[PDB]
Amino acid sequence: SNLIEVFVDGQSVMVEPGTTVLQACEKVGMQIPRFCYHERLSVAGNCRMCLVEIEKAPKVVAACAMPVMKGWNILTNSEKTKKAREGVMEFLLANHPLDCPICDQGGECDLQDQSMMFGSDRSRFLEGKRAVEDKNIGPLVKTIMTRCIQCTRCIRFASEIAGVDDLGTTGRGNDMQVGTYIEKMFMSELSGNIIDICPVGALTSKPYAFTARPWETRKTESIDVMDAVGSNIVVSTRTGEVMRILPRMHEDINEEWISDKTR
Amino acid sequence: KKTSFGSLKDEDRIFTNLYGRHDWRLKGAQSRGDWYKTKEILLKGPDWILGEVKTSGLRGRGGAGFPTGLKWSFMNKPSDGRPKYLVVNADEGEPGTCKDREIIRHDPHKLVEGCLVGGRAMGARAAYIYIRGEFYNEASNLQVAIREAYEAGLIGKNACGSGYDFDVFVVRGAGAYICGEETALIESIEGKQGKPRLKPPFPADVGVFGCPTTVANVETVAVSPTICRRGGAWFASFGRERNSGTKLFNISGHVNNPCTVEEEMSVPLKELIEKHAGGVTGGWDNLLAVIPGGSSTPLIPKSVCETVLMDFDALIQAQTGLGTAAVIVMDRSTDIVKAIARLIEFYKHESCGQCTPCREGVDWMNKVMARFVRGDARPAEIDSLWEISKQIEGHTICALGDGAAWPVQGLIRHFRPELEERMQQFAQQHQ
Amino acid sequence: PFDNTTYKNLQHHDYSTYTFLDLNLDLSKFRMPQPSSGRESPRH
Amino acid sequence: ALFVHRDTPENNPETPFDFTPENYKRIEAIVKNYPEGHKAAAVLPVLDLAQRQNGWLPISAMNKVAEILQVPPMRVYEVATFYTMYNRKPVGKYHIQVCTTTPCMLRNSDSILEAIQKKLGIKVGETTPDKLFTLIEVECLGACVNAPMVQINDNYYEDLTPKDIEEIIDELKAGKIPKPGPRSGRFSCEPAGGLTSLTEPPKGPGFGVQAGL
Ligand SMILES: Cc1cc2nc3c(=O)[nH]c(=O)nc-3n(C[C@H](O)[C@H](O)[C@H](O)COP(=O)(O)O)c2cc1C
Ligand code: SF4
Ligand code: SF4
Ligand code: SF4
Ligand code: FES
Ligand code: FES
Ligand SMILES: [K+]
Known part of the structure; x- marks a missing residue:
């Protein structure tokens, strides 16, 4: 009744009002790149990887945050769009550390993969990089914060999902740092989930550290028995051994989270 | 015409x-024509006031230059149950800009009256004046001026006797240029890091x-009572069409008599400097470049400065902008690359860090510009920058x-030979 | 007598550390009652 | 210049801080400036008040503000480390702040920096052994037409020369209060050597008012 017509690369699609440009693209099976946007977290709009051209609009818009307008044509693959992604990826990687061989994210990293699909294939950055001190937040999550890309997913998850207002940003500018400021442990029953939603190897599982690589694991979709919720899980194994536990999306049970005992 | x-x-x-030569407190302000027939303005209704502002052609004095009557009329709508507010942007952080400082401390009652008149136009119940924390003495002048208005019945309950309740709160900043941005200012008032909001939603x-x-600049709001008294047509009789009224100018840098002065819009840049600032240091022929509208606007070389006018449309054609109308003058003794490198260093220290292209990009631009100053680079890097x-x-x-990108582009656009020369000197020295 | 030769903004030479907040405290008796969002805070 | 806190003997959650009764009344007025349900808006002014009473912000002071306003301590830490006017290390009795952005740089603010460093025997970012003066560079202070200028505590001192700044430091060491403002001929921002505008008597009430009011 109140659905409005929008176009994704000229293909009409009917969407409810309030739907964002990113959600409109999803309806035609196009996944806009993203780093800060998580569909279960509050909208942030700070990574700028989702910038997309609207036909006849001279300014690219943040797809994750911009509501669609009737008759808008979203050019998900225009040169204007592709150049925006390349520029943002170049900034994201300017100070990122050359850590892939020693970084646990390697092989299942959104920064690696989107650099492959949407970024340039080389660097023109001729300066020294930023280096950040790591911060101890407990025995479950290891922090290598020089890898952080300041997406604030962890802050929003801790505040909104876990109900713990302990994570934040200190300083400002290029020196802005995610952390707790003081020496504090993020020991919530849902804390381990921030490993999953951190797109990079800034936050990783301490127990899992260094033991495997994503491509060599076998995924057994199973159920958790650590409580009576029955959270859907993926049991990662390799060469006959259990390597780790991951959440499995179930909207009506655990969504995409598991408890730390489950994990 | x-x-x-x-x-x-x-x-x-x-x-x-403007120069503090007369009493700044209420008694002086009244004798100079402030607070005169404020009740009549308020009882003429918001639609009359917005029409006066619309017809005056007033454009935002904070930097963006958006037409004011149109912008203020977005608040002209029925209330849905929430209170409505007028935030006054007294952050005054743009390098080269100090015009708002003189209004706040020497003509505070014009701002306080402007708050009420503009607040009435929008239907707001109060005004928060966000003034940068480094202006402690100016902020104390404003609170003194606000106290007098409350004690005269000019604000508060039944303001001026119009049956309209209006409060004027002063809230101080804590050191951040980014809190001059409209939405970053709002987050600062709410007690957060001064990080801008995405739009939509619009404020x-x-x-x-x-x-x-509605976030309005101090100058935009301070002139509003006078436009209502003397009429929009009187204000629109000044400056080129679509570039109406009188503007405050700050001439700083390499002039003989740096000063703040009020001058008609569309005045020539050359006349403005010679008439009020005493001319460029070492003679007009000693001019190298001018930053015409604060650090965020690209510079222009002497050739453009010869005939350019000071208004929004004129300076856009010269590939720059009027900005805050802060005129920074550089004579031929200036190391132009160093001068622009220092501005990029400023944006580096002021970036809120929220979003990737500025958090990482501005810092990257700063690191490159530092090497350009010494010539420790290659000519191909200029196109990369x-x-x-x-x-x-x-x-x-x-x-x-x-605003961080434009100064860099202006330097490359007009002084590329200077950049290449410096790299030539560095290369031949280490050769 | 009209005098355009003397600076008349010399009060701030005598302002101190609490002048701004003392004035804010003084103004508190003039303000309209604040509006309410209906709860103590967003965390309630 | 670090944005992490490490507890030390003179800066830990047990460091004694608390507002005086006089400041608790000022805090009440600050909170009344904002709608009920949005008390977090008072974080910046109340944090600044704690620094005015104490001179700087120990972590205990940040926690005290958080407790008073019922705001998570991290949200107070975020504000304290974002805004540059908050001192998270003890500073000197006189915090000299020299503007070095381009408009002040063009008027030889470097000489002002030299004069302060030569006279005080310290470098930018340091404090004197007597803990009287702390010196830092800052960005534009909104007084560019009066460059070169510096801010000491709440006061601006403008159109400076190496001599003028050296005198101000003498006045501060001796315990005197140097009057703020330009140290040249002029009083504020008017052109030197005579006004080029605003020379006529100001017009009185009702001048040029449009018909119909
Ligand atoms: C980094 C940045 C700093 C700004 N600083 C100020 C400022 O100090 N004062 C101001 O009036 N506007 C400033 N602005 C512009 C405001 O965002 C906004 O456009 C303006 O306050 C609107 O008021 P106006 O329409 O009356 O001009 C700044 C903008 C940016 C992006
Ligand atoms: S986070 Fe991704 S891109 Fe960065 S080092 Fe680890 S695997 Fe490589
Ligand atoms: S630690 Fe990870 S999730 Fe948190 S802001 Fe950095 S990149 Fe984002
Ligand atoms: S990072 Fe820079 S561009 Fe982005 S919101 Fe902050 S100040 Fe603005
Ligand atoms: S995904 Fe939209 S800005 Fe990050
Ligand atoms: S550049 Fe120094 S006060 Fe503006
Ligand atoms: K991760």
């Missing part, structure tokens, strides 16, 4: 205590405390990112 502009007369100057829908808000600035521009959340 009028073809030449400038030579404004004291009879037609809005800010008559007129969801602003301070989540309520309909131009491309990098274009990746920041138009891709960031707020316009600080654009």
Whole structure:
């Protein structure tokens, strides 16, 4: 009744009002790149990887945050769009550390993969990089914060999902740092989930550290028995051994989270 | 029509205590024509006031230059149950800009009256004046001026006797240029890091405390009572069409007599410097470049400065902008690359860090510009720096990112031979 | 007598550390009652 | 210049801080400036008040503000480390702040920096052994037409020369209060050597008012 017509690369699609440009693209099976946007977290709009051209609009818009307008044509693959992604990826990687061989994210990293699909294939950055001190937040999550890309997913998850207002940003500018400021442990029953939603190897599982690589694991979709919720899980194994536990999306049970005992 | 502009007369100057030579407290302000027939203005209704502002042609004096009557009329709508507010932007952080400082401390009652008149136009119940924390003495002048108005019945309950309740709160900043950005200012009032918001929603829908808000510059609001008294047509008789009224100018840098002065819009840049600032240091022929509208605007070389006018449309054609109208003058003794490198260093220290192209890009531009100052680079890097600035521009959340790119582009656009020469000197020295 | 030769903004030479907040405290008796969002805070 | 806190003997959650009764009344007025349900808006002014009473912000002071306003301590830490006017290390009795952005740089603010460093025997970012003066560079202070200028505590001192700044430091060491403002001929921002505008008597009430009011 109140659905409005929008176009994704000229293909009409009917969407409810309030739907964002990113959600409109999803309806035609196009996944806009993203780093800060998580569909279960509050909208942030700070990574700028989702910038997309609207036909006849001279300014690219943040797809994750911009509501669609009737008759808008979203050019998900225009040169204007592709150049925006390349520029943002170049900034994201300017100070990122050359850590892939020693970084646990390697092989299942959104920064690696989107650099492959949407970024340039080389660097023109001729300066020294930023280096950040790591911060101890407990025995479950290891922090290598020089890898952080300041997406604030962890802050929003801790505040909104876990109900713990302990994570934040200190300083400002290029020196802005995610952390707790003081020496504090993020020991919530849902804390381990921030490993999953951190797109990079800034936050990783301490127990899992260094033991495997994503491509060599076998995924057994199973159920958790650590409580009576029955959270859907993926049991990662390799060469006959259990390597780790991951959440499995179930909207009506655990969504995409598991408890730390489950994990 | 009028073809030449400038030579404004004291009879037609809005800010008559610009230099603090007269009493700044209520008694002086009244004798100079402030608070006169404020009740009549308020009882003529918002639609009349917005029409006066609409017809005056007033454009935002904070930097963006958006037409004011149109912008203020977004608040002209029925209330949905939330309070409505007018936030006054007294952050005054743009390097080269100090015009708002003189209004606040020497003509505070014009601002306080402007708050009430503009607040009535929008239907707001109060005004928060966000003044940078480094202006402690000016902020104390304003609170003194606000106390007098409360004690005279000019604000508060039944303000001026119009049956309209209006409060004027002063809230101080704590050191951040980014809190001059409209939405970053709002987050600062709410007690957060001064990080801008994405738009939509626009502040007129969801602003301070989540309520309909209009952010207006101090100068934009301070002239509003006078436009209502003397009429929009009187204000529109000044400056080129679409570039109406009288503007405050700050001439700083390499002039003989740096000063703040009120001059008609569309005055020539050359006349403005010679007439009021005493001319460029070492003679007009000793001029190298001018930053015409604050650090965020690209510079222009002497050749353009010869004939350019000072208004929004004239300076856009010279590939720059009027900005805050802060004129920074550089004579031929200036190390131009060093001067622009220092501004990029400023944006580096002021970036809120929220969004990727500015958090990483501006710091990258700063590191490159530092090497350009010494010539420790290669000519191919100049085109790389131009491309990098274009990746920041138009891709960031707020316009600080654009404001960091534009100075770099201006330097490359007009002084590329200077950049290459410096690299030639560095290369041949280490050769 | 009209005198355009003397600076008349010399009060701030005598302002101190609490002048701004003392004035804010003084103004508190003039303000309209604040509006309410209906809860103590967003965390309630 | 670090944005992490490490507890030390003179800066830990047990460091004694608390507002005086006089400041608790000022805090009440600050909170009344904002709608009920949005008390977090008072974080900046109340944090600044704690620094005015104490001179700087120990972590205990940040926690005290958080407790008073019922705001998570991290949200107070975020504000304290974002805004540059908050001192998270003890500073000197006189915090000299020299503007070095381009408009002040063009008027030889470097000489002002030299004069302060030569006279005080310290470098930018340091404090004197007597803990009287702390010196830092800052960005534009909104007084560019009066460059070169510096801010000491709440006061601006403008149109400076190496001599003028050296005198101000003498006045501060001796315990005197140097009057703020330009140290040249002029009083504020008017052109030197005579006004070029605003020389006529100001017009009185009702001048040029449009018909119909
Ligand atoms: C980084 C940045 C700093 C700004 N600083 C100020 C400022 O100090 N004062 C001001 O009036 N506007 C400033 N602005 C512009 C405001 O965002 C906004 O456009 C303006 O306050 C609106 O008021 P106006 O329409 O009356 O001009 C700044 C913008 C940016 C991007
Ligand atoms: S986070 Fe991704 S891109 Fe960065 S080092 Fe680890 S695997 Fe490589
Ligand atoms: S630690 Fe990870 S999730 Fe948190 S802001 Fe950095 S990149 Fe984002
Ligand atoms: S452009 Fe810079 S100042 Fe503006 S929101 Fe982005 S990071 Fe912050
Ligand atoms: S995904 Fe939209 S800006 Fe990050
Ligand atoms: S550049 Fe120094 S006060 Fe503005
Ligand atoms: K991760």
